[PDB]
Amino acid sequence: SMSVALHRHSNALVDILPPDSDSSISVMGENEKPDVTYADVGGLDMQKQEIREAVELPLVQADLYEQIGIDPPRGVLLYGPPGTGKTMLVKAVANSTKAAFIRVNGSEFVHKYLGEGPRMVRDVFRLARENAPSIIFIDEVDSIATKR
Amino acid sequence: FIFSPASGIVDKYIGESARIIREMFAYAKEHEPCIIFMDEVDAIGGRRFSEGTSADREIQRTLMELLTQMDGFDNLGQTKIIMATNRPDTLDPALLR
Numbered sequence: 294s295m296s297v298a299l300h301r302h303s304n305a306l307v308d309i310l311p312p313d314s315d316s317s318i319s320v321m322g323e324n325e326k327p328d329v330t331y332a333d334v335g336g337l338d339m340q341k342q343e344i345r346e347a348v349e350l351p352l353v354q355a356d357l358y359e360q361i362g363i364d365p366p367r368g369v370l371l372y373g374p375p376g377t378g379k380t381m382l383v384k385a386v387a388n389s390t391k392a393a394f395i396r397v398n399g400s401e402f403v404h405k406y407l408g409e410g411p412r413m414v415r416d417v418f419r420l421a422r423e424n425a426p427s428i429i430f431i432d433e434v435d436s437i438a439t440k441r
Numbered sequence: 442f443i444f445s446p447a448s449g450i451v452d453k454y455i456g457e458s459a460r461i462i463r464e465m466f467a468y469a470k471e472h473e474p475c476i477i478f479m480d481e482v483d484a485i486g487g488r489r490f491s492e493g494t495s496a497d498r499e500i501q502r503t504l505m506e507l508l509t510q511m512d513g514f515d516n517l518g519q520t521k522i523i524m525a526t527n528r529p530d531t532l533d534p535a536l537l538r
């Protein structure tokens with residue numbers, strides 16, 4: 294599933310677009326990344342080791358997971374009360390990995406026009422796949438993951 | 442000096458209500474130094490709920506944005522927010538934070 298160009302007055306696929314085009318989002322980090330390294334974060338040493346093995350480690354050494362034969366960690370969920378430095382711990386890995394790192398909020402995916410939320414969901418994945426390995430961070434995902 | 446009732450930025454329309462709020466800070470940055478003043482932030486800074494109705498769950502969508510707009514990876518230069526409230530007790534714990 295990729296962007297493609299259509300001719301207005303008939304509906305026909307008259308040429309194709311590369312998977313980079315047609316996103317509202319982009320890969321930041323060119324100079325727009327924070328300065329907050331591992332060093333800037335104080336403790337939570339357990340959370341550091343744990344999250345580095347969750348996110349960073351699958352990329353740098355995929356070969357080890359396949360070898361041992363363990364399921365690599367896929368999606369990461371960060372729970373904990375507000376004001377614990379959840380977002381700041383992820384800031385650190387955004388500098389450190391030196392891969393693509395996207396940026397995105399849950400309110401990037403709600404929109405005024407109807408069904409133009411889903412069209413963004415497809416866009417952020419497609420972009421991530423192209424410049425893979427990639428980390429997508431949805432800052433607050435509360436409004437999408439509502440239970441009712 | 443942006444003067445903003447917190448209860449005139451919520452529309453009927455679906456996430457237009459959040460579209461205004463992002464713009465409000467994006468205006469601010471561009472006129473920097475600037476001040477965003479919100480009156481009565483019980484309105485859209487309410488308690489968490491998530492057992493409300495559709496109307497209240499709407500409020501979660503605008504609040505969640507405004508929380509990330511204040512602190513994210515985006516930093517504010519000299520954009521300063523003075524919020525005023527009649528009770529800090531019924532404001533969100535994540536805002537109050």
Ligand SMILES: Nc1ncnc2c1ncn2[C@@H]1O[C@H](COP(=O)(O)OP(=O)(O)OP(=O)(O)O)[C@@H](O)[C@H]1O
Pocket residue numbers: 333334335336337374375376377378379380381382512535538
């Ligand atoms: N271990 C730490 N060392 C230094 N500063 C820290 C530490 N933990 C948290 N802080 C500070 O607290 C700030 C707020 O943290 P952060 O925004 O990352 O929080 P959060 O728990 O993910 O909450 P919210 O959902 O309200 O954003 C950080 O920007 C940082 O200044």
Ligand SMILES: [Mg+2]
Pocket residue numbers: 432433508509535
């Ligand atoms: Mg938040």
